Amino acid sequence: ALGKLQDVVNHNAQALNTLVKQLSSKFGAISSVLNDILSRLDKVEAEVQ
Amino acid sequence: TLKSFTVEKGIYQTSNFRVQPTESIVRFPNITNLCPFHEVFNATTFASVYAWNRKRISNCVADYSVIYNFAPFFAFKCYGVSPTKLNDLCFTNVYADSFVIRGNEVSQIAPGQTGNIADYNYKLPDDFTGCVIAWNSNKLDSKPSGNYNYLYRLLRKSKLKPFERDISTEIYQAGNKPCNGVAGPNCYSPLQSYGFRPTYGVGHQPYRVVVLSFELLHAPATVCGPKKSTNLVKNKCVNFNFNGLTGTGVLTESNKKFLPFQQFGRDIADTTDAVRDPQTLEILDITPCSFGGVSVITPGTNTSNQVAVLYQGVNCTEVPVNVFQTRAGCLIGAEYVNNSYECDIPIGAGICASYQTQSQSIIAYTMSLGAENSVAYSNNSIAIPTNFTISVTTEILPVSMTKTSVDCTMYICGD
Amino acid sequence: ALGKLQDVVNHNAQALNTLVKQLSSKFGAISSVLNDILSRLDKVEAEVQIDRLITGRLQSLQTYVTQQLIRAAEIRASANLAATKMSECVLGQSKRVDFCGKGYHLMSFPQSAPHGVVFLHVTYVPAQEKNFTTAPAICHDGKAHFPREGVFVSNGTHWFVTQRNFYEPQIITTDNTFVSGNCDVVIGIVNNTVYDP
Amino acid sequence: MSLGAENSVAYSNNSIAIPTNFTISVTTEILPVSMTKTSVDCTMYICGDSTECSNLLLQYGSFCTQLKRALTGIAVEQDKNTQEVFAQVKQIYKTPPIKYFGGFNFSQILPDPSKPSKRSFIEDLLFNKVTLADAGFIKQYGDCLGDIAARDLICAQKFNGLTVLPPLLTDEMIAQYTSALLAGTITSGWTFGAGAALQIPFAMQMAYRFNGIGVTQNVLYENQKLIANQFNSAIGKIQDSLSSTASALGKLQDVVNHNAQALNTLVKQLSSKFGAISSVLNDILSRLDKVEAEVQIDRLITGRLQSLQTYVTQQLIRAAEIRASANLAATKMSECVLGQSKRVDFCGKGYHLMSFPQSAPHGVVFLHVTYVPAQEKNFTTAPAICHDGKAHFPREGVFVSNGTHWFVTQRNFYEPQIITTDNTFVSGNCDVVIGIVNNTVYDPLQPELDS
């Protein structure tokens, strides 16, 4: 019977979960970790990534 | 604009109008010297890697096409400016460097580069503009016994800043024991010769490198390119060129008080507002030329092929890119009558237009809110109805819309 | 008359039309056709062009979904209003002014329409007014008589009591009047007689 | 934080509290109706009379067509909101030249014909309270041409392809609509909202309003001077509250502030580099060759396109919010001004009698006249009265006792009367009602028959 307030809770949980999961993407770069980009490349290529 | 052959009654925004500039204005400071590039590129021996020279170049016209006739170089590699368009803009400081390096460290001269020359001998800044003339020197920097006239340093205790020198020679120590000027245990002199020989590989041949550096227009200009100046005219939509910046606007006189070290004036959107003439000490404002939007007012194509044009938000004494000035610009093609009807086509602040017979024509009018009524009020008078009517009224409300679905893999990619 | 449902149809047609038409743009690549890029180039350069195409088509799809969400919010607000009007006009009688039609609301009849609903609002409209002279009370034997429901009106010689929304004049009687006070406090009280049955 | 004072009402099963006086209160509700209409040119904003930038901008398809369509839909919707709120009357009703409405003083909401713009005193105060941003409803290119002091914010806003369209209805027409609604409400009551305007004296109309909320009409005819004095004092208090505090109009000022701030951010975003080597487009054109400047211009085009899309999206969401507020304001105009509302806390706080609209910048202001009970007293009450083996219930009202005698009185005002068969009805015997008391019931026929 109380599905509306549960949906209000679940939507705001799921949006923050998706925002956390979006950090794992590469977006066309060579690595999803910023430190490995900074340590594995020169200035220009790491600046592009 | 509507992608159709029949339009309906209404007002449609079609395009925009821009007042075109007529003349071209070129302004440059007056200099007659030529920058002596011929005296730098040819020498018996260049400076060392650690003792590279600096030449201050200013107040001269520099023709950069003569650099191709002084050296047979392969790569004219540049970063912040293209090599074919140095004759148009102007600068404020030009540098010059000269050193001779090995063939395996030619690519070490780069912004954001590390290594041996780029870390301890010759470091360029990350925001470097201007570029480098580099060519092979196996003809003049080679001996059968070897060339020992050039020195390089192996390493030092820390990193080295861009545009920094190191002339003094000290014995390096990597321990607690003192060297005391004698290259003993953990004591080595950091200077050794290149030893240029023709019996080595293709990657170790000597090279001649000349580096030029530019400074952007953050100051009054001294160095310019070969470009004829132009007389100054004002109060007219022109194409000015003030010391290498292009633009379009109406140059006027100014009442702004400028400090003696000031020559520019910027906006919030980083757009030039005022400018200083390089010839005379006068400050000119920059205001862009007139523009706006164009709205076409028509009835349907089944009724007429006549239109009326509204140029939005302009005082239209400057209209050539029935003329009646409204608050929303001015209206061309429709005449203003001293009547008041219902609003057919809305134009602007209280003005509407329609298609009436007084021969058919498009007219503009001030819209009427309603019929004037004055109900008789009295303190001992009432009005009571004696009959009635029954009325049926239709009200329409949307409820749902079209449900759609998408497939990303077939929309973006398509199997 | 039915421009709102027609606009509802036209917006959903136009959004899909421009979403299909956005597949012809190059978005900085060499071609808008993926097979031409895949056949005309090696792996790395085609990967660059496919990255540009993917970015452009993802941006267009996100714009479409955001516009559809805003339009769905507006449509849901209109559907809530239509459900309230179905509950309050059809299923009862509404006292709210200019709700359920202009006038005094009597009935309503739902009618189905494409992507919507149509209400036929039956209302009562008074037609033929007539001037009368009126008074707030009637002074009779030192007493102030106020009407229980209605209004005192006069045609010039006789005073009657009648209802507010129709002219049904009746003789002033103690059955349709009540008394509270005397004739020294009401402003505008007039002199007449009150019939006792 | 404190939720409020602690109260303990004395509930009992034979105790009632009935007010003996009242007070007339005029409140104030402020609602936004419409916001600023804007139109943005893409080619002047992103590129700015650069042909190469336009050529690379044409490769992104039809983004700018749908941004232009969205802004046009917002600009049409704003005029629709103002039309559906204010243009509800069919004729421009005129107030009579006399100034007697039963003692009620309406001279500070009726218009003043001495000034050119026919606006009232409260309308002038509400227009002076909100500081206008000097928008594009007046053309300003002649002022932007003549450079006085420094560069204005509005000139630098308009120089980058941002245009503000004037509203269709001027403030004179909004004030004329408000004057027509006020004249119709004062003269004809609620009769002008359901057909023709039927005139009625204002005291009798106010007695109809009192009869609507459950108070008999002789209360007004006995307390007309007191109620008129209370209304005039409430109107003067409204004037003092609007002259003293300027923070009551925060919603319209919030609308103005957001409409200025969005355009300020849109202008400020033109100075960013977005990864390019420079933000000025002419420097990139005059410094580099074709391909590398095409790369830099591509970066600038993508950044400015993203900023313009963000501006259009937040304008769409704000337009939806303003449209919901305008629907509420239209409902309040149709139900408070054009009638009398029985809905609780709609149309003010209390028992609703009248309402008077006033025009404001980007909105409307309502003056809700209400009825508030003032001075209560304790009484002993009963559900029914037993008499001759019959239970008597009141027709309209409540049985009260002052300690020795039983009376019948109405609900919202203490006007006790003798318990009589005229104001009571009989239903059943006395064995079914819990709490029935013993008293006599007067018969008017008995002394008339014996005389």
Ligand SMILES: *[C@@H]1O[C@H](CO)[C@@H](O)[C@H](O)[C@H]1NC(C)=O
């Ligand atoms: C440049 O022009 C100014 C004014 O015309 C003049 O005073 C100055 O001597 C000129 N300088 C040269 C080097 O011609």
Ligand SMILES: *[C@@H]1O[C@H](CO)[C@@H](O)[C@H](O)[C@H]1NC(C)=O
């Ligand atoms: C090199 O420059 C000098 C002037 O410094 C000139 O005399 C000589 O002819 C030049 N040589 C060549 C090969 O260009």
Ligand SMILES: *[C@@H]1O[C@H](CO)[C@@H](O)[C@H](O)[C@H]1NC(C)=O
């Ligand atoms: C702007 O238009 C008004 C309209 O009458 C005119 O009076 C005024 O002179 C115009 N300003 C100019 C031409 O600078």
Ligand SMILES: *[C@@H]1O[C@H](CO)[C@@H](O)[C@H](O)[C@H]1NC(C)=O
């Ligand atoms: C009632 O109206 C008449 C006619 O306008 C006026 O002379 C009279 O003064 C009014 N009554 C009062 C009490 O003002």
Ligand SMILES: *[C@@H]1O[C@H](CO)[C@@H](O)[C@H](O)[C@H]1NC(C)=O
């Ligand atoms: C009532 O009296 C007014 C004022 O004399 C007059 O204008 C009107 O025509 C009369 N009749 C009706 C039906 O209102």
Ligand SMILES: *[C@@H]1O[C@H](CO)[C@@H](O)[C@H](O)[C@H]1NC(C)=O
């Ligand atoms: C009504 O009649 C009373 C006496 O019955 C008299 O005193 C009073 O003046 C009359 N009022 C009018 C308005 O004629």
Ligand SMILES: *[C@@H]1O[C@H](CO)[C@@H](O)[C@H](O)[C@H]1NC(C)=O
């Ligand atoms: C009525 O209230 C009194 C005290 O307030 C209580 O003692 C009594 O039980 C109540 N009556 C009934 C029927 O419960």
Ligand SMILES: *[C@@H]1O[C@H](CO)[C@@H](O)[C@H](O)[C@H]1NC(C)=O
């Ligand atoms: C209404 O009030 C104003 C000031 O509040 C006053 O000047 C005016 O005289 C009043 N009206 C009457 C009829 O007294």
Ligand SMILES: *[C@@H]1O[C@H](CO)[C@@H](O)[C@H](O)[C@H]1NC(C)=O
């Ligand atoms: C009524 O009675 C309560 C408690 O019996 C008391 O607190 C209150 O002051 C009395 N008077 C009024 C006017 O409520």
Ligand SMILES: *[C@@H]1O[C@H](CO)[C@@H](O)[C@H](O)[C@H]1NC(C)=O
């Ligand atoms: C009221 O009177 C009747 C008879 O007169 C009596 O039977 C009854 O008890 C009385 N009620 C109370 C509450 O005493």
